[PDB]
Amino acid sequence: VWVVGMGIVMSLIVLAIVFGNVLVITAIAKFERLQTVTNYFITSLACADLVMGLAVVPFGAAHILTKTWTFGNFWCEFWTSIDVLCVTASIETLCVIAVDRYFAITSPFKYQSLLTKNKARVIILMVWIVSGLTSFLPIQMHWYRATHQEAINCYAEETCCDFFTNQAYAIASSIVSFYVPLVIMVFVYSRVFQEAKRQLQKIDKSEGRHKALKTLGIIMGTFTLCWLPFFIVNIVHVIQDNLIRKEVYILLNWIGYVNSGFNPLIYCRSPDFRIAFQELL
Ligand SMILES: CN[C@@H]1CCc2c(ccc(O)c2O)[C@H]1O
């Protein structure tokens, strides 16, 4: 009386994740007014979210509901690698967007020279390659495996797939994928808020006769509340074996997945995108 309807939520999540990013990509590609230097980062982020929604989520839902992994071990490793790659690429693209806004606001005269159509491509490719070296290489070369007794039994059986990793890979992956972008974004947005407050102070000092907090709160709170709880327990469960159960780990990981759906509502609600969406359908 549960699994007959518990998949409806997963189906709705998949539909929303696919549709939002497909609409964003179609709006950027089809309408010529939108194409800009900053809009390419949104394109890469939407591509990462689309790949996640198309590949990662449905197989995880099937594994959860059916309780068995009917597919082979090779496909299981492929799925894990794709998952890690997509997560890393999405978070690093968010950090790139934040840094771009920092450079746009803090130094207005020199903004044009720093960012050009031929410099954005190299940055995006570097981000995706750095993401790829984290996921595919350590997994396919069999460096992340664990040596405790249950790990060998999990690896041998072809019917089951449970994540088992050693200490070094977990720590290094968490540090590379989450914490450094978090620090960079924190510093960036603190500086941006200071500049905005100074400008409002000047506009109040002249012509004498609150709004940035809402935007910054949305932008930081969504990402932090979505992704921070997962990585803390990700680091924790390795140092202390009995501390963290697997069900909470899976629940937090699936909470992290949903964050890909909220990105179009955050980064794509400008008037130009509204006009493009209105014209599209
Ligand atoms: C299958 N779940 C994976 C397992 C570990 C992991 C994830 C995401 C980013 C990382 O850097 C990780 O090390 C999770 O999505």
Q: For atom 13 of ligand 1, which residue has the closest CA?
A: 173
What's the structural domain count of the chain? 1
Residue 63 to residue 13: CA distance in whole angstroms: 16
> Structure resolution in Å?
3.4
How many angstroms separate the alpha carbon of residue 124 from the centre of ligand 1? 21
Residue (of 49, 60, 55, 47) closest to 17 by Cα position: 49
How many angstroms separate the alpha carbon of residue 47 from the centre of ligand 1? 19
Do residues 112 and 32 make contact, with C-beta atoms less than 8 angstroms apart? no
**Experimental method of this PDB entry:** cryo-EM
Q: For atom 8 of ligand 1, which residue has the closest CA?
A: 84
Residues having CB closer than 6 A to ligand 1 are: 80, 83-84, 87, 163, 173-174, 177, 253
Do residues 229 and 250 make contact, with C-beta atoms less than 8 angstroms apart? no
Compute the residue count for the chain.
281
Residue 130, amino acid: V
Residue of 76, 78, 86, 87 with the most ligand 1 atoms within 8 Å of its CB, for mutation: 87
Per the annotation, where are the binding residues for (S)-timolol? 83, 88, 234, 253, 257
Residue 49 to residue 120: CA distance in whole angstroms: 19
Domain that holds residue 249: 3-280
3-class SS letters over 112-172: HHHCCHHHHHHHHHHHHHHHHHHHHHHHHCCCCCCCCHHHHHHHHCCCCCCCCCCHHHHHH
Distance of CA 238 to the CA centre of its chain: 23
Per the annotation, where are the binding residues for (S)-carazolol? 83, 173, 253
Do residues 273 and 34 make contact, with C-beta atoms less than 8 angstroms apart? yes
Residue 190 to residue 200: CA distance in whole angstroms: 16
- The CATH number for 51's domain is 1.20.1070.10
Cα 133 to Cα 88, 97, 130, 158, 269, distances in angstroms: 10, 21, 5, 26, 33
Cα 5 to Cα 69, 222, 238, 248, 261, distances in angstroms: 21, 28, 34, 21, 21
Residue 73, amino acid: N
CB atoms within 10 A of CB 124: 19
Atom of ligand 1 nearest to the CA of 60: 1
Atom of ligand 1 nearest to the CA of 80: 1
Residue 164 to residue 147: CA distance in whole angstroms: 9
Residue of 77, 139, 173, 257 with the most ligand 1 atoms within 8 Å of its CB, for mutation: 173
Helices (H), the chain: 3-30, 39-51, 57-66, 73-106, 111-114, 117-140, 149-156, 167-174, 180-205, 211-239, 246-267, 271-280
Structure tokens at 106: 């803090």
